[PDB]
Amino acid sequence: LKITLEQLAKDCISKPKMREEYLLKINQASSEAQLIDLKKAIIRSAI
């Protein structure tokens, strides 16, 4: 679900602004496959 992955992001990535923007988009994003894509992007985006 959207908010579940929002929480995942909040607990995963570092830059609060980039977090804000990825959140702004994921609430608009609606493709479950693209949700998995953004999820893997979040995980590998920990730098």
Partner 1 sequence: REILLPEVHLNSPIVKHKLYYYILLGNLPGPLHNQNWNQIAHEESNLAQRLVNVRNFLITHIPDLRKGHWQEYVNVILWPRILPLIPDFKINDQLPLLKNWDKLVKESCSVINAGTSQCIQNLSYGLTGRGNLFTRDIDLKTVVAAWHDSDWKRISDFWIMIKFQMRQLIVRQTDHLITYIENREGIIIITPELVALFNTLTYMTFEIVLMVSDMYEGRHNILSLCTVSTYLNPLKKRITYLLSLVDNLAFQIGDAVYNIIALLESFVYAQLQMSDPIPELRGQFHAFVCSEILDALRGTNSFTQDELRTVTTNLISPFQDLTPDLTAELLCIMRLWGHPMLTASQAAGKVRESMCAGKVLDFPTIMKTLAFFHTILINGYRRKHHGVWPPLNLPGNASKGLTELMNDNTEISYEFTLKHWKEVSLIKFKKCFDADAGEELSIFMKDKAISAPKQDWMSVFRRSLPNPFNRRLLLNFLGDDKFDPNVELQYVTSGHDDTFCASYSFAKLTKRMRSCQVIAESLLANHAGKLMKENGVVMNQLSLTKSLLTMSQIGIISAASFLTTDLKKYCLQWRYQTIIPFAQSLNRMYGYPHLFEWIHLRLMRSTLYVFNPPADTSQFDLDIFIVSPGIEGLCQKAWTMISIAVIILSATESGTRVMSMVQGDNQAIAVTTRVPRSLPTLEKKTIAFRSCNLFFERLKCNNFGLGHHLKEQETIISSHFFVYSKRIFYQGRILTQALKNASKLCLTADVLGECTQSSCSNLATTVMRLTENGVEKDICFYLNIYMTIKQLSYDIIFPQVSIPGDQITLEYINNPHLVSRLALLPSQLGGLNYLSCSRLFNRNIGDPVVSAVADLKRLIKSGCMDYWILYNLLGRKPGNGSWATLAADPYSINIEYQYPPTTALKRHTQQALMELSTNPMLRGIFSDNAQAEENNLARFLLDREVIFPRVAHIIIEQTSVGRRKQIQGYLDSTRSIMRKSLEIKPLSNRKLNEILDYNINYLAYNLALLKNAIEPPTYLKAMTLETCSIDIARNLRKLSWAPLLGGRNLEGLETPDPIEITAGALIVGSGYCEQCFTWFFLPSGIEIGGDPRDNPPIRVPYIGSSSSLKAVLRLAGVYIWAFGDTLENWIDALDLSHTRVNITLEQLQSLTPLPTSANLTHRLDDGTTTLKFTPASSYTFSSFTHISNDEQYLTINDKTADSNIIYQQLMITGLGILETWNNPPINRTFEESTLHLHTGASCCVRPVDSCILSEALTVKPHITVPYGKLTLLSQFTARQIINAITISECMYTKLDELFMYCGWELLLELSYQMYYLRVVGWSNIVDYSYMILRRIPGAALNNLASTLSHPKLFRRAINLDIVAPLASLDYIKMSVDAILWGCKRVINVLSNGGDLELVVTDRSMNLIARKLTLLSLIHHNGLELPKIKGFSPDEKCFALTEFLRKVVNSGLSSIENLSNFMYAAFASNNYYLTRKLLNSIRDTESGQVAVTCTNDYIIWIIESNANLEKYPIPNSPEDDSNFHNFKLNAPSHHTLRPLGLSSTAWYKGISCCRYLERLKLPQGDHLYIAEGSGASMTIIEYLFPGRKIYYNSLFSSGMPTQFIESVPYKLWQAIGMTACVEFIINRCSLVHVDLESSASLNQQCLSKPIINAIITATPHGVLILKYSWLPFTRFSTLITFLWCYFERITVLRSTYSDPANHEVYLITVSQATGMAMTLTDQGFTLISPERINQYWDGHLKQERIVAEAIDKVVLGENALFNSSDNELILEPVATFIEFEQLICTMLTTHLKEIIDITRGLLGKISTIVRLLTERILNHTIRNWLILPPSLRMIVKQDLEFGIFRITSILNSDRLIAQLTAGYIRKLIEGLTRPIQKQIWKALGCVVYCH
Q: Which two tokens stand for residue 32?
A: 């479950």
SS3 38: helix
Is residue 5 a contact residue for partner 1 (CB under 8 A)?
Answer: yes
Structural contact between residues 22 and 38, judged by C-beta atoms closer than 8 angstroms: yes
Sequence-separated (6 or more) residues with CB below 8 Å from residue 9 = 19, 22, 23, 26, 42
Shortest Cβ 23–partner 1 spacing (Å):
13
Is residue 18 a contact residue for partner 1 (CB under 8 A)?
Answer: no
The binding track of 28-47 with respect to partner 1, each residue x by CB under 8 A or -, is -------xx--xx--x----
Q: Which residues bind partner 1 (CB under 8 A)?
A: 1-5, 7-8, 11, 35-36, 39-40, 43
